[PDB]
Amino acid sequence: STRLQEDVHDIELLQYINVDCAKLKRLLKETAFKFKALKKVAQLAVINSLEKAFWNWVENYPDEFTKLYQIPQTDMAECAEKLFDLVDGFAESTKRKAAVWPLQIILLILCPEIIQDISENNMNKKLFLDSLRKALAGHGGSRQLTESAAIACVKLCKASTYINWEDNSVIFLLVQSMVVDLKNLLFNPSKPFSDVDLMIDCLVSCFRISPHNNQHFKICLAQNSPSTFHYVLVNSLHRIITNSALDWWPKIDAVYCHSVELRNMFGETLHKAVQTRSYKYLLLSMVKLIHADPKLLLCNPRKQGPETQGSTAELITGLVQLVPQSHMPEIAQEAMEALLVLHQLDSIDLWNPDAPVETFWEISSQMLFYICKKLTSHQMLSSTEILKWLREILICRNKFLLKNK
């Protein structure tokens, strides 16, 4: 407050404060009354600090954000209209404008009442929203304007993710106007975007809002020409596997029917594992996903039977080929713990759904002899970590032999 009374870094302190509704009430009141007329860049510091503070509130207390829409609250409406008038008074140049709409979206979402009023104060709101829509159209807009529209849409839909649609029907009435536009500029296969975090968050949110099979999910999935789109896909899938906590329960552990294609994609870059720069990051992200969850690539039976080349066997032979490699340490490092997680009993229940007893000893002897011949080759620099991991593999094998009886 003393900082706000009059090179300003104490504002960013509220970027790191644990806040609730009552704290943002008094904080947003203090930035509302004084409104800091006498500076320019500290206004932007206040603006993006309020952005990160709003996000901190909505992960910390999602129930308050749900009850904001379930029961209307008027102090948020009047304070948000006050700050919207202040922000609209602040920005006239296109740079400051393209800065401020990532807060104008939040400041509009904070009001449940006036979103239906969009469909004296209303004309500025309608004009700025339609200015965002024209930037989404891509024509009649600045180069920084279209990027800011995409940031506005991804933050808007991420705000829309948390609340249920049965709480309010106005949220899909908003976002379904913009889903086709965001898909058009974001997830087209031909033209590159104006990065990767925006597509990851956009993809995660667009199958929060849709439990159906997304055609754009097929676009980034099946042999898309941008390999960065595949990186976005695998990283977003890792976000689904790891980072779900009160997030919307459709589309987790529900994309398993695509799973064998993912293994096929692995096989493609497995050949690119043999012999560029973007290839190894994609490999590292996929093997992080395997270490995070191996049940995705094992729940599909995947032509079980040794007459066909076993897909589980193909994957594990690819991993154990990737283990004793010294051209890159980090990729070989991650597959090591991926294998030792894979050798746990719950993982090897999914190894052979027909009979888990049969092929586990066979493929374990296969990887055992393959790694022991490489250790006999002796031309290693870091074979002691291989020895420790092999010791853990021996522990897991003896545990499964105890369970096998």
Coordinates of C-alpha atoms in Angstrom, one line a residue:
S1 CA 0.0 0.0 0.0
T2 CA 2.9 2.4 0.8
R3 CA 4.4 1.4 -2.6
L4 CA 1.1 2.0 -4.3
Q5 CA 0.8 5.4 -2.6
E6 CA 3.6 6.8 -4.8
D7 CA 11.8 0.9 -11.0
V8 CA 8.8 -0.3 -9.0
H9 CA 9.2 -4.0 -8.0
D10 CA 7.1 -4.2 -4.7
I11 CA 3.9 -4.6 -6.8
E12 CA 5.1 -8.0 -8.0
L13 CA 5.1 -9.2 -4.4
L14 CA 1.3 -9.8 -4.9
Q15 CA 2.3 -12.2 -7.7
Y16 CA 3.5 -14.5 -5.0
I17 CA 0.9 -13.9 -2.2
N18 CA -1.5 -16.7 -1.2
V19 CA -4.8 -15.0 -1.9
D20 CA -8.5 -15.7 -1.5
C21 CA -11.6 -13.7 -2.4
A22 CA -11.4 -11.5 0.7
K23 CA -7.7 -10.6 0.0
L24 CA -8.3 -9.7 -3.6
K25 CA -11.3 -7.6 -2.4
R26 CA -9.1 -5.3 -0.3
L27 CA -6.2 -5.5 -2.8
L28 CA -8.3 -4.7 -5.8
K29 CA -10.0 -1.9 -3.8
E30 CA -6.6 -0.4 -3.0
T31 CA -5.7 -0.4 -6.7
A32 CA -9.2 0.8 -7.6
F33 CA -9.3 4.0 -5.5
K34 CA -5.8 5.4 -6.1
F35 CA -5.5 3.9 -9.6
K36 CA -1.9 5.2 -9.9
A37 CA -2.3 8.0 -12.4
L38 CA 1.3 9.2 -12.2
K39 CA 3.3 6.5 -14.0
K40 CA 3.1 4.4 -17.1
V41 CA 5.1 1.1 -16.9
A42 CA 4.2 0.5 -13.3
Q43 CA 0.6 0.4 -14.5
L44 CA 1.5 -2.6 -16.7
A45 CA 3.3 -4.1 -13.7
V46 CA 0.1 -3.7 -11.7
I47 CA -1.8 -5.2 -14.6
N48 CA 0.2 -8.4 -15.1
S49 CA 0.6 -8.8 -11.3
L50 CA -3.3 -8.8 -11.1
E51 CA -3.2 -11.4 -13.9
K52 CA -1.0 -13.8 -12.0
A53 CA -2.9 -13.0 -8.8
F54 CA -6.2 -14.0 -10.4
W55 CA -4.7 -17.2 -11.6
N56 CA -3.2 -17.9 -8.1
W57 CA -6.7 -17.4 -6.7
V58 CA -8.4 -19.7 -9.2
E59 CA -6.0 -22.6 -8.5
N60 CA -5.9 -22.0 -4.8
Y61 CA -9.7 -21.7 -4.2
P62 CA -11.7 -23.0 -7.1
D63 CA -14.8 -23.3 -4.9
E64 CA -14.9 -19.5 -4.5
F65 CA -14.7 -19.1 -8.2
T66 CA -17.5 -21.6 -8.7
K67 CA -19.7 -19.8 -6.1
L68 CA -19.0 -16.5 -7.8
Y69 CA -21.0 -17.8 -10.8
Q70 CA -23.4 -19.9 -8.7
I71 CA -24.5 -17.0 -6.5
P72 CA -24.0 -13.5 -8.0
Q73 CA -21.8 -11.0 -6.1
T74 CA -22.2 -7.3 -6.7
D75 CA -19.0 -5.9 -5.2
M76 CA -17.0 -7.9 -7.9
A77 CA -19.3 -6.4 -10.6
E78 CA -19.0 -2.8 -9.5
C79 CA -15.2 -3.0 -8.7
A80 CA -14.6 -4.7 -12.0
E81 CA -16.6 -2.1 -13.9
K82 CA -14.6 0.6 -12.2
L83 CA -11.3 -1.0 -13.2
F84 CA -12.6 -1.6 -16.7
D85 CA -13.3 2.1 -17.0
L86 CA -9.8 2.9 -15.6
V87 CA -8.2 0.4 -18.1
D88 CA -10.2 1.8 -21.0
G89 CA -9.1 5.2 -20.0
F90 CA -5.5 4.1 -19.8
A91 CA -4.9 2.4 -23.2
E92 CA -5.2 4.2 -26.5
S93 CA -2.1 3.1 -28.4
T94 CA -2.2 -0.4 -29.9
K95 CA 0.8 -1.6 -27.8
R96 CA -0.9 -0.7 -24.5
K97 CA -4.2 -2.0 -25.9
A98 CA -2.7 -5.3 -26.8
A99 CA -1.2 -5.4 -23.3
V100 CA -4.5 -4.7 -21.5
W101 CA -7.0 -7.1 -23.1
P102 CA -5.4 -10.1 -21.3
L103 CA -6.8 -8.4 -18.2
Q104 CA -10.0 -7.1 -19.8
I105 CA -11.0 -10.8 -20.4
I106 CA -10.5 -11.6 -16.7
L107 CA -12.2 -8.4 -15.7
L108 CA -15.2 -9.3 -17.9
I109 CA -15.2 -13.0 -16.6
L110 CA -15.3 -11.6 -13.0
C111 CA -18.8 -10.2 -13.8
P112 CA -21.5 -12.9 -14.2
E113 CA -24.3 -10.3 -15.0
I114 CA -22.9 -8.3 -17.9
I115 CA -21.9 -11.2 -20.2
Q116 CA -25.5 -11.7 -21.0
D117 CA -25.7 -7.9 -21.4
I118 CA -23.2 -8.2 -24.2
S119 CA -25.6 -10.5 -26.1
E120 CA -24.2 3.4 -21.2
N121 CA -21.3 1.3 -20.1
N122 CA -22.1 -1.6 -22.5
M123 CA -20.8 0.0 -25.7
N124 CA -17.1 0.0 -24.6
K125 CA -17.4 -3.6 -23.6
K126 CA -19.0 -4.6 -26.9
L127 CA -16.6 -2.6 -28.9
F128 CA -13.5 -4.1 -27.3
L129 CA -14.9 -7.6 -27.5
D130 CA -15.6 -7.1 -31.2
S131 CA -12.1 -5.7 -31.6
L132 CA -10.9 -9.0 -30.2
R133 CA -13.1 -10.9 -32.6
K134 CA -11.8 -8.9 -35.6
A135 CA -8.3 -9.7 -34.5
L136 CA -9.4 -13.4 -34.3
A137 CA -10.5 -13.0 -37.9
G138 CA -6.9 -12.1 -38.8
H139 CA -7.8 -9.2 -41.1
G140 CA -7.9 -5.5 -40.2
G141 CA -5.5 -6.0 -37.3
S142 CA -2.0 -5.3 -36.2
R143 CA 0.7 -8.0 -36.0
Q144 CA 0.8 -7.9 -32.2
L145 CA -3.0 -7.7 -32.1
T146 CA -3.6 -11.2 -33.4
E147 CA -1.2 -12.7 -30.9
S148 CA -2.9 -10.9 -28.1
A149 CA -6.2 -12.1 -29.3
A150 CA -4.9 -15.7 -29.1
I151 CA -3.6 -15.1 -25.6
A152 CA -6.9 -13.6 -24.7
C153 CA -8.8 -16.7 -26.0
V154 CA -6.5 -19.2 -24.3
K155 CA -6.7 -17.5 -20.9
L156 CA -10.5 -17.1 -21.4
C157 CA -11.0 -20.7 -22.1
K158 CA -8.7 -21.7 -19.3
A159 CA -10.9 -19.6 -17.0
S160 CA -13.9 -21.4 -18.5
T161 CA -12.4 -24.8 -17.8
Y162 CA -12.8 -24.8 -14.0
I163 CA -16.5 -24.2 -13.6
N164 CA -19.3 -26.6 -14.5
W165 CA -21.6 -25.9 -17.5
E166 CA -24.6 -26.8 -15.4
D167 CA -23.7 -23.9 -13.1
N168 CA -24.0 -21.4 -16.0
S169 CA -24.9 -21.8 -19.7
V170 CA -23.4 -18.5 -20.7
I171 CA -19.8 -19.9 -20.7
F172 CA -20.3 -22.1 -23.8
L173 CA -22.5 -19.3 -25.3
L174 CA -19.2 -17.3 -25.1
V175 CA -16.5 -19.8 -26.0
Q176 CA -18.3 -21.7 -28.8
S177 CA -18.2 -18.5 -30.8
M178 CA -14.4 -18.6 -30.5
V179 CA -13.5 -22.3 -30.7
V180 CA -13.5 -22.4 -34.5
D181 CA -11.4 -19.2 -34.7
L182 CA -8.8 -20.4 -32.2
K183 CA -8.6 -23.8 -33.9
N184 CA -8.1 -22.0 -37.2
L185 CA -5.2 -19.8 -36.2
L186 CA -3.7 -22.2 -33.7
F187 CA -4.0 -25.8 -34.9
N188 CA -3.9 -25.5 -38.7
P189 CA -1.3 -28.0 -40.1
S190 CA -0.2 -25.8 -43.0
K191 CA 0.7 -22.3 -41.8
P192 CA 3.1 -21.8 -38.8
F193 CA 1.9 -19.8 -35.8
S194 CA 3.1 -16.2 -35.1
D195 CA 4.7 -20.4 -28.8
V196 CA 4.4 -24.1 -27.9
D197 CA 2.9 -23.4 -24.4
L198 CA -0.1 -21.6 -26.1
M199 CA -0.9 -24.7 -28.2
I200 CA -0.4 -27.0 -25.1
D201 CA -2.8 -25.0 -23.0
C202 CA -5.2 -24.5 -25.9
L203 CA -5.3 -28.2 -26.5
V204 CA -5.7 -29.1 -22.9
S205 CA -8.6 -26.7 -22.5
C206 CA -10.4 -27.6 -25.7
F207 CA -10.7 -31.2 -24.6
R208 CA -11.7 -30.0 -21.2
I209 CA -14.7 -28.3 -22.9
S210 CA -15.3 -31.3 -25.2
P211 CA -15.3 -35.0 -24.0
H212 CA -16.0 -36.0 -27.6
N213 CA -13.3 -37.2 -30.0
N214 CA -11.8 -34.0 -31.3
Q215 CA -10.9 -33.8 -35.0
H216 CA -8.0 -31.4 -34.2
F217 CA -6.8 -34.1 -31.8
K218 CA -6.6 -36.3 -34.9
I219 CA -4.9 -33.4 -36.7
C220 CA -2.0 -33.2 -34.2
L221 CA -2.1 -37.0 -33.8
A222 CA -1.9 -38.7 -37.1
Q223 CA 1.3 -37.8 -39.0
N224 CA 1.1 -34.1 -38.8
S225 CA 3.7 -32.2 -40.7
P226 CA 4.8 -29.9 -37.8
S227 CA 6.7 -32.1 -35.5
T228 CA 6.3 -29.3 -32.9
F229 CA 2.6 -30.1 -33.0
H230 CA 3.5 -33.7 -32.0
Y231 CA 5.7 -32.3 -29.2
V232 CA 2.7 -30.2 -28.0
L233 CA 0.5 -33.3 -28.1
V234 CA 2.9 -35.5 -26.1
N235 CA 3.6 -32.7 -23.6
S236 CA -0.1 -32.0 -23.2
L237 CA -0.8 -35.7 -22.6
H238 CA 1.9 -35.6 -19.9
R239 CA 0.1 -32.6 -18.4
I240 CA -3.1 -34.8 -18.4
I241 CA -1.3 -37.7 -16.8
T242 CA 0.4 -35.7 -14.1
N243 CA -1.2 -32.3 -13.4
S244 CA -4.9 -33.1 -12.9
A245 CA -6.1 -31.9 -9.4
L246 CA -9.8 -30.9 -9.3
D247 CA -9.5 -30.3 -13.1
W248 CA -12.4 -31.5 -15.2
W249 CA -12.6 -35.3 -15.1
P250 CA -13.5 -36.1 -18.7
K251 CA -10.5 -36.9 -21.0
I252 CA -8.1 -38.4 -18.6
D253 CA -7.3 -42.1 -19.3
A254 CA -9.8 -41.9 -22.1
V255 CA -7.5 -41.5 -25.1
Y256 CA -6.3 -45.1 -24.8
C257 CA -7.9 -46.1 -28.1
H258 CA -5.3 -44.0 -30.0
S259 CA -2.5 -45.5 -28.0
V260 CA -1.0 -48.0 -30.5
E261 CA -0.6 -45.1 -33.0
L262 CA 1.5 -43.4 -30.3
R263 CA 3.7 -46.5 -30.2
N264 CA 3.9 -46.4 -34.0
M265 CA 5.0 -42.8 -33.6
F266 CA 7.6 -44.0 -31.1
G267 CA 8.7 -46.5 -33.7
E268 CA 9.2 -43.7 -36.2
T269 CA 11.4 -41.7 -33.9
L270 CA 13.0 -45.0 -32.7
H271 CA 14.5 -45.2 -36.2
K272 CA 15.4 -41.5 -35.7
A273 CA 16.9 -42.7 -32.4
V274 CA 19.3 -44.9 -34.4
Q275 CA 20.9 -42.1 -36.5
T276 CA 17.5 -34.2 -35.6
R277 CA 17.7 -31.5 -33.0
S278 CA 13.9 -31.4 -32.5
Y279 CA 13.9 -35.2 -32.6
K280 CA 15.7 -35.7 -29.3
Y281 CA 13.5 -33.3 -27.4
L282 CA 10.5 -35.2 -28.7
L283 CA 12.2 -38.5 -27.7
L284 CA 12.9 -37.1 -24.2
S285 CA 9.3 -35.9 -23.7
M286 CA 7.9 -39.2 -24.8
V287 CA 10.2 -41.2 -22.5
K288 CA 9.1 -38.9 -19.7
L289 CA 5.6 -39.8 -20.5
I290 CA 6.5 -43.5 -20.4
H291 CA 8.2 -43.1 -17.0
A292 CA 5.1 -41.1 -15.9
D293 CA 2.6 -43.7 -17.1
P294 CA 3.4 -47.0 -19.0
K295 CA -0.2 -48.2 -18.8
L296 CA -1.1 -46.1 -21.8
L297 CA 1.1 -48.1 -24.1
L298 CA 0.4 -51.5 -22.4
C299 CA -3.4 -51.5 -21.9
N300 CA -3.9 -52.2 -25.6
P301 CA -3.1 -55.9 -26.1
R302 CA -1.3 -54.8 -29.3
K303 CA -1.2 -58.1 -31.4
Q304 CA -0.2 -60.3 -28.5
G305 CA 1.5 -63.5 -29.6
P306 CA 5.1 -64.1 -30.5
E307 CA 4.4 -64.9 -34.1
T308 CA 3.9 -61.2 -34.6
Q309 CA 6.7 -59.0 -33.4
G310 CA 5.5 -58.1 -29.9
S311 CA 4.7 -54.4 -29.5
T312 CA 5.5 -54.5 -25.8
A313 CA 8.7 -56.4 -26.8
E314 CA 9.4 -53.8 -29.6
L315 CA 9.0 -50.9 -27.2
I316 CA 11.2 -52.5 -24.5
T317 CA 13.9 -53.5 -27.0
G318 CA 13.9 -49.9 -28.2
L319 CA 14.3 -48.7 -24.6
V320 CA 17.1 -51.2 -23.8
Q321 CA 18.8 -50.2 -27.0
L322 CA 18.5 -46.6 -25.9
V323 CA 20.1 -47.5 -22.5
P324 CA 23.8 -48.0 -23.2
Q325 CA 24.3 -45.0 -25.4
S326 CA 26.9 -42.3 -24.8
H327 CA 26.0 -39.8 -27.6
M328 CA 23.3 -38.4 -25.3
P329 CA 23.3 -39.0 -21.6
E330 CA 19.9 -37.5 -20.6
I331 CA 17.6 -39.6 -22.9
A332 CA 19.4 -42.8 -21.8
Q333 CA 19.0 -41.6 -18.2
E334 CA 15.2 -41.2 -18.3
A335 CA 14.6 -44.6 -20.0
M336 CA 16.5 -46.2 -17.1
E337 CA 13.9 -45.3 -14.5
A338 CA 11.2 -45.8 -17.1
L339 CA 12.3 -49.4 -17.3
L340 CA 12.5 -49.9 -13.6
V341 CA 9.0 -48.5 -13.2
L342 CA 8.0 -50.8 -16.0
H343 CA 9.5 -53.8 -14.1
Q344 CA 7.1 -53.3 -11.2
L345 CA 4.4 -55.9 -10.6
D346 CA 1.4 -53.6 -11.6
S347 CA 3.1 -52.6 -14.8
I348 CA 3.9 -56.2 -15.7
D349 CA 0.3 -57.2 -15.1
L350 CA -0.4 -55.2 -18.2
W351 CA 2.7 -56.7 -20.0
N352 CA 0.8 -59.9 -21.1
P353 CA -2.9 -59.7 -20.4
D354 CA -3.2 -63.3 -21.7
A355 CA -0.8 -64.8 -19.2
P356 CA 1.7 -62.5 -17.4
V357 CA 3.9 -65.4 -16.3
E358 CA 5.0 -66.5 -19.7
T359 CA 6.7 -63.7 -21.6
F360 CA 8.1 -61.7 -18.7
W361 CA 10.9 -64.1 -17.9
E362 CA 11.7 -64.4 -21.7
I363 CA 11.9 -60.6 -22.3
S364 CA 13.7 -60.1 -19.0
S365 CA 16.3 -62.7 -20.0
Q366 CA 16.5 -60.8 -23.4
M367 CA 17.1 -57.4 -21.9
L368 CA 19.4 -59.0 -19.3
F369 CA 21.7 -60.7 -21.8
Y370 CA 21.6 -57.7 -24.1
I371 CA 22.7 -55.4 -21.3
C372 CA 25.3 -57.9 -20.0
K373 CA 27.0 -58.2 -23.4
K374 CA 27.2 -54.4 -23.6
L375 CA 28.8 -54.5 -20.1
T376 CA 31.3 -57.1 -21.4
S377 CA 32.1 -54.7 -24.2
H378 CA 33.6 -52.6 -21.4
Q379 CA 33.9 -49.4 -23.4
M380 CA 31.7 -47.3 -21.1
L381 CA 32.2 -44.2 -19.0
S382 CA 29.2 -44.4 -16.7
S383 CA 28.6 -48.1 -16.2
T384 CA 28.2 -47.9 -12.4
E385 CA 24.8 -46.3 -12.8
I386 CA 24.0 -49.2 -15.2
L387 CA 25.1 -51.5 -12.4
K388 CA 22.8 -49.8 -9.8
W389 CA 19.8 -49.9 -12.2
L390 CA 20.5 -53.6 -12.9
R391 CA 20.6 -54.2 -9.2
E392 CA 17.1 -52.7 -8.9
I393 CA 16.0 -54.8 -11.8
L394 CA 17.3 -57.9 -9.9
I395 CA 15.3 -56.8 -6.9
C396 CA 12.1 -56.4 -8.9
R397 CA 12.7 -59.8 -10.6
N398 CA 13.2 -61.5 -7.2
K399 CA 10.0 -59.8 -6.0
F400 CA 8.0 -61.1 -8.9
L401 CA 9.6 -64.6 -8.5
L402 CA 8.3 -64.4 -4.9
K403 CA 4.8 -63.4 -6.2
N404 CA 4.9 -66.0 -9.0
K405 CA 5.2 -69.1 -6.7

